[PDB]
Amino acid sequence: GPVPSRARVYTDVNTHRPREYWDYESHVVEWGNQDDYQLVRKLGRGKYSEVFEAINITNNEKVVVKILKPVKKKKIKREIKILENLRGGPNIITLADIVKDPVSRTPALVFEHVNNTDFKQLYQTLTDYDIRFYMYEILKALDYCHSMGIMHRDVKPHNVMIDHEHRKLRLIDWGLAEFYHPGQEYNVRVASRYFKGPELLVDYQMYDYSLDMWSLGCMLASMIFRKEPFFHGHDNYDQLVRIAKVLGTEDLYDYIDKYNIELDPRFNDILGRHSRKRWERFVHSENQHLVSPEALDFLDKLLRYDHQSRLTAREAMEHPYFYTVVKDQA
Ligand SMILES: O=C(O)c1ccc2c(c1)nc(NCCCCCCCNCc1ccc(-c3ccccc3)c(Cl)c1)c1ccncc12
């Protein structure tokens, strides 16, 4: 069998909390009236929800309604319980109300409206400071919700909202978020392919907040190298290969030996032998400004197979890659 694993941080927080904090299936929901909210325009479609721009008609205030696509009651309480526990926290989206439509009784979540900015002109006026800054901001949310014993589990660019004019960032979609419990065994069919961590790729189930950190390493490696996506898999199985071909097969098998993962037999033919490439293989004429010895040392300290080896969010924020944003904050 496999080896059990525990987070190197925030390991038993949820155990030391009042039962109801994490027992979301027993959480009671006081479903409002969606008629307090008039839909304006369709903001996006996801796999378990649809998102509209709406107006609360008792202050003319601007909100966002997230009609939930039909799912097990269970998953809605999870996402609500996590939102309510994280409410107020640095850079976390603000759950404003929980309502059902009178006719459908289909549940929908009201959120704080954030003005995001067109990602077109976002990727063009993105400076090597801008990345540092906004990445620190995502860590504020990541370190918060982790300290609160919660894993986002879907940290991708589609889930980061930037109001560049105010420098306001909000980590969003918590529909996959879960409570960390030492010993608990979690599903591997979570997050999207391009940010899935190795643990997910080999079907290792006792992971933790380290999952969020790989995702973020992928996001960071995309922007400093100007390669969207950075690990470009055809399928889930080839995604590990696109990762192997950069991190080496050596550390990969060692990862597997250390946790004794029953590596799936397909793999045993498509991986192979590849060295641990040197990062400067990926810096070229168009991207050398975002790249710095500081940046690469942080990036190398996030993209590891050993989930236990990757930095923690707090450990990440004290890295020297962020010395400049910290000073200017104080
Ligand atoms: O369900 C939920 O919870 C939820 C809650 C609230 C809202 C929601 C869903 N949906 C909304 N509408 C559509 C979402 C897709 C656009 C998301 C921008 C894409 N992201 C841009 C970027 C730019 C730069 C970087 C970057 C920065 C530093 C380093 C590397 C990368 C990154 Cl990472 C992301 C919405 C709209 C208005 N108000 C609230 C919400």
Q: How far is the CA of 271 from the centre of ligand 1 (A)?
A: 34
Is residue 74 domain-shared with residue 192, that is, in the same domain? no
Is residue 151 within 8 A of residue 13, CB to CB? The reply is: no
User: Which tokens in the block code for residue 136?
Assistant: 């620190």
CATH of the domain at 62: 3.30.200.20
Atom of ligand 1 at shortest distance to CA of 83? 3
Give Cβ neighbours of residue 78 (< 8 Å, ≥ 6 apart): 24, 177, 178
CATH of the domain at 289: 1.10.510.10
Full residue range of the structural domain in which residue 206 is found: 119-329
Task: Say how far apart CA 318 and CA 322 lie, in whole Å.
Answer: 7
Is residue 144 within 8 A of residue 90, CB to CB? The reply is: yes
Which of 48, 69, 81, 116 has most ligand 1 atoms within 8 Å of its beta carbon, as the pocket-test mutant?
116
Is residue 157 domain-shared with residue 132, that is, in the same domain? yes
Which of 69, 161, 171, 223 has most ligand 1 atoms within 8 Å of its beta carbon, as the pocket-test mutant?
161
Which residue has its alpha carbon closest to ligand 1 atom 25?
157
Is residue 201 within 8 A of residue 240, CB to CB? The reply is: yes
Closest to 309 (Cα-Cα) out of 198, 203, 229, 200? 198
Q: How far is the CA of 256 from the centre of ligand 1 (A)?
A: 35
User: Which tokens in the block code for residue 36?
Assistant: 């307090």
**Given 36, 97, 130, 154, the catalytic residue:** 154
Whether 235 sits among the annotated catalytic residues: the reply is: no
Task: Say how far apart CA 100 and CA 106 lie, in whole Å.
Answer: 5
Is residue 77 domain-shared with residue 210, that is, in the same domain? no
User: Which tokens in the block code for residue 150?
Assistant: 């919660």
Bin 61: left if φ > 0, else alpha if -120 < ψ < 50, else beta: beta
**Single-letter code of the amino acid located at 258:** K
Select from 112, 146, 167 the last residue of a domain: 112
Closest to 220 (Cα-Cα) out of 210, 232, 230? 230
Task: Tell me if 301 is assigned to some domain.
Answer: yes
Is residue 255 within 8 A of residue 305, CB to CB? The reply is: yes
**Single-letter code of the amino acid located at 114:** V
Locus of tokens 């922007």: 223
Give Cβ neighbours of residue 133 (< 8 Å, ≥ 6 apart): 167, 325
Closest to 78 (Cα-Cα) out of 214, 173, 189? 173
Is residue 184 within 8 A of residue 153, CB to CB? The reply is: no
Give Cβ neighbours of residue 34 (< 8 Å, ≥ 6 apart): 65, 99, 100, 101, 102, 108
The pocket around ligand 1, CB under 6 angstroms, is made up of 43-44, 51, 64, 66, 93, 111, 113-114, 116, 119, 122, 131, 134-135, 157-158, 160-162, 172-174, 219-220, 223
Q: How far is the CA of 14 from the centre of ligand 1 (A)?
A: 28
Cis geometry, peptide bond prior to residue 320 (ω within 30 degrees of 0):
no
Q: How many residues does the chain have?
A: 330
Which residue has its alpha carbon closest to ligand 1 atom 3?
173
- Calculate ∠ Cα 150-153-159, nearest 5°: 105
112: β partners:
63
Pairing of strands 95-100, 32-33: parallel
Is residue 66 domain-shared with residue 168, that is, in the same domain? no
Task: Tell me if 147 is assigned to some domain.
Answer: yes
User: Which tokens in the block code for residue 9?
Assistant: 């941080």
**Three-class secondary structure assignment of the chain:** CCCCCCCCCCCCHHHHCCHHHCCHHHCCCCCEEHHHEEEEEEEEECCCEEEEEEEECCCCEEEEEEEECCCCHHHHHHHHHHHHHHCCCCCECCEEEEEECCCCCCEEEEEECCCCCCHHHHHHCCCHHHHHHHHHHHHHHHHHHHHCCEECCCCCHHHEEEECCCCEEEECCCCCCEECCCCCCCCCCCCCHHHCCHHHHHCCCCCCCHHHHHHHHHHHHHHHHCCCCCCCCCCHHHHHHHHHHHHCCHHHHHHHHHHCCCCCCCHHHCCCCCCCCCHHHHCCCCCCCCCCHHHHHHHHCCCCCCCCCCCCHHHHHCCHHHHHHHHHHC
Is residue 69 domain-shared with residue 150, that is, in the same domain? no
